[PDB]
Structure 1
């Protein structure tokens, strides 16, 4: 309503851009929504769903996760801190997935996209779990352009949350794969100033961040496990009108706090 939305509008007025938020209490079904069906660039946040798509494919292809990917130096793209170190040996699909999630490794992401049939393959996986909003159209690094009006490489806060719920808490992944995905998100160290900063320290959190680097466009989605309560799933996405507008981790954390504090 208006008292739900009012603190969000104030926050994005001070931020100088747009904030999109969706949070779901998986026990009661209560939600908090703000610009939740608007499109925002995914940036690197797609890499979480990328790892989930790989895990799901391993349910149909036994031993996919252990497949060695031996790549050449030209497979490397900027911001590939893990894959650059294994150029002389190669990495398995599961090792690449861990790097894509926890270090946002770009070469790892592109290698896994290639295994799935390109960006179209990741989009097809998201369609397979009932996500009709998600679209990945381009590769790293071009998908980070975040140009105003462009629907390529975007989703909505609601669809991100709904798909994250299906993959981490629903039946989309088998228990071993589900455990693996949750562990990668929980061990992610790139989001300490985003959704995690809004959550009490004793509550476990798994997240995946995105930071396009332009147009104040950055994001985070997370599963939150309140002690002995039903988990929460939420997504916080930002963008801004000017190419050199700075993203704000504080704004993401503040919006996350508002959403978590508003759940019935």
Structure 2
């Protein structure tokens, strides 16, 4: 715990880490049951919920969603570009996962019954910690002590493992989720910064409205041994802030991979 405590003391906020080696069952755990804001990291689980529905509704993924300008919100780079033609459910899911597209996330949330619908999906796979309460952009508020729109590193990692490597999704859906995570573009300074180049990573980041509150979760595939699943979440110390959240996440991920046998 000391390397994590020292990293946390240098950071000035709180860090939470859970890593599980799916080969040996060994774990690394630091503040792993505390709540941290999800921020955009809910969008990965949102895409998984879409894929779960695709087990039961044929054609869902290729179903076009025609949306108007009223659906757009800041930081929606894909959905703004296709505003003229609309986007399918699969295209919105890829945009939400790989570009953190906010309008795409809200459109998919609506499709799934809102924040309550996504929370119910997470309950259905055995996650009792996750809660989504609000939409983009309101869910980013990251008010200290507020349980809205939070989970724990352990619950995130356990749910991620079930959805990417376990039995919570059928194989084709699982592979599509893995592919979306593998193609994420927003995590190049986080967990991916901690891994050897010849491994593979799928991840989803989150960055909240307060500097110092950020996160990343990932499946990491080493060469020649079983994958690692891990989550690293931060809460800001508690305009022109300089909290080095991304470097702390990468450093924590390094310690987790180094600490496993």
* Alignment TM class, shorter chain as reference: over 0.9
Return the offset for 1:163: 0.2
Tell me whether 1:258 sits opposite 2:242 in the alignment: no
Deviations 1:159-207 (A, max 9, x none): 0000000000011111111111101111112111110111000000100
Residues 216 and 243 of structure 1 are in contact (CA less than 8 Å); yes or no, is this contact kept in structure 2?
no
Structure 1 residues 107-162: Cα deviation after superposition (integer angstroms, max 9, x where no partner): 00000000000000000000000000000000000000000000000000000000
Q: Is the 8 A contact 1:218 1:247 kept in 2?
A: no
1:86-113 CA distance string (max 9 Å, x none): 1111100000000000000000000000
Q: Is the 8 A contact 1:146 1:215 kept in 2?
A: no
Alpha-carbon offset, residue 213 of structure 1? 3.2
Runs of 4+ in 1 over 6 A off after TM superposition: none
- CA–CA distance in 2 between the matches of 1:213 and 1:111? 21
8 Å CA contact 1:214–1:243 kept in 2: the answer is no
State how far apart, in whole Å, the 2-side matches of 1:100 and 1:166 are: 20
Contact 1:225 1:232 in 2 (8 A): yes
Q: How big is the shift at 1:69?
A: 0.3
Q: For residues 26 and 138 of structure 2, what CA distance do their matches in structure 1 show?
A: 37
SS state at 2:96 partner: helix
* CA shift for structure 1 position 247: 4.8
Q: Which residue of 2 aligns with 1:235?
A: 231
Say if 2:75 is the partner of 1:79.
yes
Which shifted more, 171-180 or 237-246? Answer: 237-246
Give the unaligned 5+ runs of structure 2. none
- Is 2:49–2:118's contact at 8 Å kept on the other side of the alignment? yes
SS in 1 for 2:131: coil
Kindly tell me: are residues 99 and 196 of structure 1, through their superposed partners in 2, closer, same or farther at Cα, counting changes over 3 Å? same
Cα shift at 1:263: 1.3
Q: Once the 2 structures are TM-superposed, how far is the Cα of residue 58 of structure 1 from its aligned partner?
A: 0.7
Asked whether the equivalents of residues 11 and 243 of structure 2 are also in contact (C-alpha less than 8 Å), the reply is no
Residues 201-228 of structure 1 deviation map (CA, whole Å, 9 limit, x = unaligned): 0000100000113141000000011112
| Cα distance between partner residues in 1 of 2:10 and 2:249 | 12
Give the Cα separation in 2 of the matches to 1:49 and 1:247: 26
TM-score by length of 1: 0.96
Q: Counterpart in 1 of 2:152?
A: 156
Number of aligned residue pairs: give it.
260
Query: Which ranges in structure 1 are unaligned for 5 or more consecutive residues?
Result: none
Shift of 1:246: 3.2
| Alpha-carbon contact 2:75-2:101 (below 8 Å) kept | yes
CA-CA distance at 1:244 after TM superposition: 5.0
Instruction: State the Cα distance separating 1:60 from its structure 2 match.
Output: 1.3
The CA deviation at 1:245 is 6.4
Distance 1:243 1:160 in 2: 30
> What is the CA-CA distance between 1:84 and the residue it aligns to?
0.4
Residue 258 of structure 1 deviates from its aligned partner by 0.5
Instruction: For residue 243 of structure 1, report the CA deviation from its aligned partner.
Output: 11
